[PDB]
Design a protein around this ligand. Structure first.
Ligand SMILES: *[C@@H]1O[C@H](CO)[C@@H](O[C@@H]2O[C@H](CO)[C@@H](O[C@@H]3O[C@H](CO[C@@H]4O[C@H](CO)[C@@H](O)[C@H](O)[C@@H]4O)[C@@H](O)[C@H](O[C@@H]4O[C@H](CO)[C@@H](O)[C@H](O)[C@@H]4O)[C@@H]3O)[C@H](O)[C@H]2NC(C)=O)[C@H](O)[C@H]1NC(C)=O
Ligand SMILES: *[C@@H]1O[C@H](CO)[C@@H](O[C@@H]2O[C@H](CO)[C@@H](O[C@@H]3O[C@H](CO)[C@@H](O)[C@H](O)[C@@H]3O)[C@H](O)[C@H]2NC(C)=O)[C@H](O)[C@H]1NC(C)=O
Ligand SMILES: *[C@@H]1O[C@H](CO)[C@@H](O[C@@H]2O[C@H](CO)[C@@H](O)[C@H](O)[C@H]2NC(C)=O)[C@H](O)[C@H]1NC(C)=O
Ligand SMILES: *[C@@H]1O[C@H](CO)[C@@H](O[C@@H]2O[C@H](CO)[C@@H](O)[C@H](O)[C@H]2NC(C)=O)[C@H](O)[C@H]1NC(C)=O
Ligand SMILES: *[C@@H]1O[C@H](CO)[C@@H](O)[C@H](O)[C@H]1NC(C)=O
Ligand SMILES: *[C@@H]1O[C@H](CO)[C@@H](O)[C@H](O)[C@H]1NC(C)=O
Lengths: 245, 213, 101, 216, 106
């Protein structure tokens, strides 16, 4: 539908992704592309029980602080995260498309250091991805995600606004936290593809990067960012709630 | 090795409910999908992910999955729902297709209705007289028509035509025409059509006499 | 060279809930096929058109019949229309009940 | 359709992406006559990596040509059991249910070529007033056709009966050869059933004499 | 000119038993009228669906047919059913004729 310097939007990327996947590990994540297990069949709850469900910690006061620091160890399987800022990534660590979010899903391909597109399936050593994460009002995308060649997901995005207390009572919301801030909106504090703590911006490979959301249902949403309009479909679960915020 | 089993065949009467079960080991944690294959046709999807049903399939089809069995329940079965049904699942990075189950809907017997039409006056003027015996809305297909001309059997000089089965009702139709020459027809008194077919306690005779009216 | 539509008149009385039957017989026509239509070609309930049968001397024959409620015969009327292409012939006949007197 | 010679190879083709986002995973399914379905492998247009089933690991090879936007599977060394209808499904990317089953393709193979098997048929050892007994030499489990049966180098032809070949359920053939001869000449004359089958260069001879009854 | 049929039965070979298969053959010699019917009964119990028949054509100087009926049994099935019998029905015969053989004693 359209192509550009990086944004191969319109849902049509051609071959410029980096097809460097390794099968030495027997986890067989690549073989898990055809089918997805049930929620309670893959041992999700043990991995999903490490983060506080609804009310994590309360106020953090009015000032919207930015202390991105570094979030580098835990996997981004639940909406808790403090993703760091990534500008470039060697193309020897990517296995599949790198979907990035305007928030509307967008694909970024392999490019030369100087920016010349290269057509080598990312096999070449010099291949590198250039993605300087910047907010939509200043251009580029919030942040985005891919799969590392060993079989583990990755995330990256702009600084997340900081909020917390004193009794080990810190909540660093990377998205939403509507009631816990003076009107924190995804257009400001949004970092990754987590629109709200129980929603996702669905894309063709969503079930592959976050296979603990297989039970999620579909929805069609309309969002305004900056001074433009976005039509999007987001996947939110029907976990007991009132979805009219 | 992973193997799925289903009953070899299931028979149900129209308007009733038939149950088809797919059984395995701890099958409750898999995402099954049901396929309906008619004779000589490519299989089509009838259920995916236990209960979710695609577009174009009637609400009659339904499913469930729990424990060690997955059920495909059909309510208000009719003659159109006769076909092989297969069960699917994924395991150990390999596809498994369950043994085909054949669903056959037994048909009910319908007594034939027999009518006889005497030869037309206009045709009689042309030298040839035609007598037609009709059987419609009858089942099964095996029905025998016998002609009598004043207690005399007729062999040959008779054509038999049959239509195609009706999907909605599963019934046929039969027309038997007897031709004669003008002189021959005029030289007999009582004509009769005899039908022998299942669903009739005794053969039924529909008859008439010529020249009466 | 013949449409030869011959009425198949209904039973003398058959006066009951026993829906009667009537039809038209097309005979000695060729080549196939022929289209048979009822009133204004707008009747489909309880209509049968048996497949053509090969007559003895290389001719074709076909019969069409319709089941109609007994009471309707008094006022309603029926017409059999036959279309034979290689004759470019259309023929209409009225299948009236026998006088029976 | 045309019957493929054994030991050959066959190709089945399915429409494939021309080098852009696909959003579907291809698979191949086979159905032997009235035997259910089976799986062979898969293919993901985005990831050229293929997936092969355990059963057909050593004979299948999945490859695609993006220029022609067509993907095909090559099956080599066909045998009798490889006669079936080949389907080609296309399901969603990561839901694992196959929808839009395309038209099937039928491929047939004609067994193999092997020699016949000869067995004797014991004549009745009981005395008969008429003095007539029937000997028989049976040739079965052979392919292709035809065969010729002769007795005593063909020197005997009075009463020889050779029933026509009848197809067996397996796929091969069967036959029989029978002669009626005087009872009193059973032990003094030698009977040999001569079977020759050129397609296999097989010439087998067999003697037929009344079987024992624990007497001798 | 109606001629009755001559019926013969040949037990299985001593060598086929080594190949895990049994095959009993019932033969009908020259008989004029084409219509005929054979019934395979083992242990006074009929069977059908696992038998085949073949026929030749009456030769020039004759008008009689010859028919055979080969019954195939899977391995270890022949090991039982002591008694076997081939029954033939045809015109001319006073009553249906049965040729039978015990499986034991040759
Ligand atoms: C990786 O990068 C690209 C992948 O884009 C590939 O190389 C080029 O990319 C095309 C495939 O994506 C090659 O195929 C040809 O490209 C043109 C159209 O193909 C594309 O796909 C869609 C159609 O689905 C188009 O809208 C886009 O414009 C893409 O280019 C045509 O060259 C050609 O299409 C047809 O064939 C005839 C025969 O020549 C053409 O004359 C006619 O125009 C017709 O449309 C074909 O589909 C493209 O040629 C190729 N070019 C080069 C220089 O490589 C390779 O896989 C990788 N390498 C490179 C260097 O890009
Ligand atoms: C792509 O990302 C995945 C993310 O899981 C990488 O696996 C990660 O590897 C790290 C670093 O090697 C692991 O933690 C560290 O590994 C070594 C021992 O192997 C040791 O030096 C450290 O003390 C620690 O154990 C970790 O298993 C894993 N990260 C997780 C689970 O969050 C994968 O290797 C990456 N591929 C690359 C960078 O090519
Ligand atoms: C986009 O990517 C990074 C983000 O700053 C910049 O690339 C830098 O490269 C130098 C030399 O290798 C290193 O300091 C780091 O690898 C990168 N700097 C970082 C990660 O801070 C690049 O200049 C950026 N371009 C922009 C923002 O326009
Ligand atoms: C592959 O990586 C190597 C290292 O950068 C480069 O190979 C070059 O090929 C280009 C033409 O594509 C030529 O300029 C030179 O022959 C090679 N080396 C250099 C330093 O230029 C190239 O950058 C990468 N490209 C491909 C297509 O393999
Ligand atoms: C890819 O996997 C192979 C084994 O599948 C193993 O050697 C290694 O992890 C990777 N290959 C290389 C060259 O490192
Ligand atoms: C998943 O299902 C239920 C409900 O979530 C949960 O209690 C259980 O641990 C899992 N398995 C089964 C069989 O219920």
């Amino acid at each position: 539908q359209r192509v550009q310097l990086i944004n191969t939007n319109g849902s049509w990327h051609i071959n410029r992704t980096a097809l460097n996947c390794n099968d030495s590990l027997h986890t067989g994540f690549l073989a898990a592309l055809f089918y997805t297990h049930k929620f309670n069949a893959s041992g999700c709850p043990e991995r999903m029980a490490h983060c506080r469900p609804i009310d994590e910690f309360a106020q953090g006061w009015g000032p919207i602080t930015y202390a991105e620091g570094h979030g580098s160890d835990q996997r981004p399987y639940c909406w808790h995260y403090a993703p760091r800022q990534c500008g470039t990534i060697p193309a020897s660590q990517v296995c599949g498309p790198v979907y990035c979010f305007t928030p509307s899903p967008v694909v970024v391909g392999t490019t030369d250091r100087f920016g010349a597109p290269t057509y080598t399936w990312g096999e070449n050593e010099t291949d590198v991805l250039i993605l300087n994460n910047t907010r939509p009002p200043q251009g580029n995308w919030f942040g985005c995600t891919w799969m590392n060649s060993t079989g583990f997901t990755k995330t990256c995005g702009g600084p997340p606004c900081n909020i917390g207390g004193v009794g080990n009572n810190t909540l660093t919301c990377p998205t939403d936290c509507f009631r816990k801030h003076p009107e924190a909106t995804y257009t400001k504090c949004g970092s990754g593809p987590w629109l709200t703590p129980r929603c996702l911006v669905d894309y063709p490979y969503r079930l592959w990067h976050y296979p603990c959301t297989v039970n999620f249902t579909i929805f069609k949403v309309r969002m305004y960012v900056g001074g433009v309009e976005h039509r999007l479909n987001a996947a939110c679960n029907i976990g007991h709630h009132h979805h009219h915020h | 090795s992973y193997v799925l089993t289903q009953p070899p065949s299931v028979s149900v009467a129209p308007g009733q409910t038939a149950s088809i079960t797919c059984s395995g080991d701890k099958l409750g944690d898999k995402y099954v999908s049901w396929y309906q294959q008619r004779p000589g046709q490519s299989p089509v999807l009838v259920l995916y992910q236990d209960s979710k049903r695609p577009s174009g399939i009637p609400e009659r089809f339904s499913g469930s999955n729990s424990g060690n069995t997955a059920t495909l329940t059909i309510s208000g079965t009719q003659a159109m729902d006769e076909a092989d049904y297969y069960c699917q699942a994924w395991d150990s990075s390999a596809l498994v297709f369950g043994g085909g189950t054949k669903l056959t809907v037994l048909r009910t017997v319908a007594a034939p209705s027999v009518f006889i039409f005497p030869p037309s006056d206009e045709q009689l003027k042309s030298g040839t007289a035609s007598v037609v015996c009709l059987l419609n809305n009858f089942y099964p297909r095996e029905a025998k028509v016998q002609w009598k001309v004043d207690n005399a059997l007729q062999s040959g000089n008779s054509q038999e035509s049959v239509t195609e089965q009706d999907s909605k009702d599963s019934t046929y139709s039969l027309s038997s025409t007897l031709t004669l020459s003008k002189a021959d027809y005029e030289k007999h008194k009582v004509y009769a059509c005899e039908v022998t077919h299942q669903g009739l306690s005794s053969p039924v005779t529909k008859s008439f006499n010529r020249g009466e009216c | 060279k013949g449409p030869s539509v011959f009425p198949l008149a209904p039973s003398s009385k058959s006066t009951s809930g026993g829906t009667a039957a009537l039809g038209c017989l097309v005979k000695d026509y060729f080549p196939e096929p022929v289209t048979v239509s009822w009133n204004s070609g707008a009747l489909t309930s309880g209509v049968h058109t048996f497949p053509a049968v090969l007559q003895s001397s290389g001719l074709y024959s076909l019969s069409s019949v319709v089941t109609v409620p007994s009471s309707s015969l008094g006022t309603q009327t029926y017409i059999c229309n036959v279309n034979h292409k290689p004759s470019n012939t259309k023929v209409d006949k009225r299948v009236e009940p026998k006088s029976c007197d």
